[PDB]
Design a binder for this molecule. Structure first.
Ligand SMILES: C[S@@+](CC[C@H](N)C(=O)[O-])C[C@H]1O[C@@H](n2cnc3c(N)ncnc32)[C@H](O)[C@@H]1O
Ligand SMILES: C[S@@+](CC[C@H](N)C(=O)[O-])C[C@H]1O[C@@H](n2cnc3c(N)ncnc32)[C@H](O)[C@@H]1O
Lengths: 291, 291
């Protein structure tokens, strides 16, 4: 067995303190070990993100515009959670594809069937006015050309919508398929437990203050660094069993999930952080039909 | 006479502490009172800008890429000044129109006849590599649509060229002809003596550190503010004779010019700041054929 003792897991990309030469043969390795693993991956990051905004008092009264939301099965759990806590939020789910019917019949959630473009964004901005917007983007079409197009659309979402905070999908293109340098919004690069086995995707979390918009340049050398750091995390780190982790599941991903869930608010009071997390995790897995 | 005593002039937009309702009839008022006033306006701001970079030690060894440089008569003076001081700079002057022949025959200055576009920018970036770039942009085609296009090209210059510093042309569109909000690079909004009588144009001065690119949003309310502050400066302030200004010319514009010129370096040593400025001003006017 691959045992180890750790204090805390890597929460952000910036914390990864080691690298490994990427081995392309990793691509043919099992990518997922859980049913609905993708909905789980998304639920944990968005709960982590949204719970943070709650702490800063910027969630209540906001309209959450989620683009690239279909099917969005996991979003029902998110909506229920904050709704049951007494937080007032209006959800606007926009995708060209159709959403899970469990999302129907809620006065607080609007499902829209439209692939957004710059023009459409301006239209709903006029519509939403003057509500505070929190943007979540999970749009996917990829090639380097595809990625750059998605990232270009994401920067457009922020400039037009002018959100108070955002969560964007972020995977650096492969250095060997570099096309050109580009800018992405400045923000924390949140790591994702339960991401595919060798995925280099993370979630860019930003909170906007004033009229300012700070971007950061990404070059090929940056791309080599992403590739090596993420390959080290996937190949070595995520394969560890954290034995000093007092929890029914000691796999690194559960250890990493624990640190995200411990930041979540519940109505029920728990004697220990361990009780709250086991409870939230049980609740999340039951909702998603994960044994 | 319209007399007054002032400590210092307004150097940046942010210093303007008053406003006036813009009177559209101002547009038919005499815009310029000096021959070659536009070359003078440009020379003072670029000398001010470049002399600052010299102070920060970021001028020597750089390549100055000036887009929208034709005819560029005043640029010969700029080139001579730093050249005579011993600073090593390569000038690259790009415009679809033709430059003043006084710029020919200098090994340190390259004249290019091309209207730049995004593709061309990438091409000269590859060319210039690995020289440090200082960008100066004076491109003009305006309508609000025209302005937005120019500003969009200017942001493209920065993202592709990735300069260490930049000077960009900046005039906020009229609120009554608003089309849509846009972002401009963050930087000091340098005011310009000898600008047309009622011009609301300034020069955006930025110094870049790291891979970061900070932008700022401009809305219609911002546009109303620009219009009123600049109209107050043009109508009231620039029409003053600063009597406590010990100088052969007490017009506000000369008082404002003095503060820019006092920051310029000369080989010749002067007993007083007044002697240096009178000398530089004499030199500048003689070069431009201004009495
Ligand atoms: C990875 S899937 C999203 C999964 C979703 N976030 C979830 O919770 O199930 C990416 C999605 O982005 C959507 N998409 C692609 N381009 C889009 C656009 N311009 N507007 C809206 N959605 C788009 C696709 O239709 C697809 O449903
Ligand atoms: C106000 S004039 C510039 C004056 C110049 N800075 C001087 O020192 O004399 C604006 C100029 O921008 C140029 N211009 C317009 N679009 C351009 C582009 N895409 N590439 C280069 N120059 C362009 C025009 O040809 C014109 O010469």
């Amino acid at each position: 067995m691959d045992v180890v003792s750790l204090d805390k897991p890597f929460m952000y990309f910036e914390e990864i303190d080691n690298e490994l030469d990427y081995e392309p043969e990793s691509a043919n390795e099992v990518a997922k070990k859980l049913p609905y693993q993708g909905q789980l991956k998304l639920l944990l990051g968005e709960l982590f993100f949204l719970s943070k905004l709650q702490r800063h008092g910027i969630l209540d009264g906001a309209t959450v515009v989620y683009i690239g939301s279909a099917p969005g099965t996991h979003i029902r759990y998110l909506r229920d959670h904050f709704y049951n806590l007494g937080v007032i939020i209006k959800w606007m789910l926009i995708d060209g594809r159709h959403h899970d019917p469990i999302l129907n019949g809620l006065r607080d959630v609007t499902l829209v069937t439209r692939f957004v473009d710059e023009e459409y964004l301006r239209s709903i901005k006029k519509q939403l006015h003057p509500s505070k917007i929190i943007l979540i983007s999970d749009v996917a079409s990829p090639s380097t050309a595809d990625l750059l197009s998605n990232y270009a659309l994401q920067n457009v979402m922020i400039s037009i919508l002018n959100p108070v905070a955002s969560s964007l999908k972020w995977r650096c293109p492969f250095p060997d398929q570099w096309i050109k340098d580009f800018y992405i919004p400045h923000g924390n690069k949140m790591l994702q437990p339960f991401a595919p086995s060798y995925s280099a995707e993370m979630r860019l979390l930003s909170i906007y203050t004033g009229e300012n918009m700070r971007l950061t340049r990404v070059t090929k050398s940056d791309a080599v660094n992403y590739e090596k750091k993420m390959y080290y995390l996937n190949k070595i780190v995520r394969n560890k069993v954290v034995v000093n982790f007092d929890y029914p599941n000691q796999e690194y991903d559960y250890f990493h999930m624990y640190f995200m869930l411990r930041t979540v608010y519940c109505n029920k009071t728990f004697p220990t952080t361990k009780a709250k997390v086991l409870f939230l995790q049980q609740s999340i897995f039951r909702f998603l039909n994960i044994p």
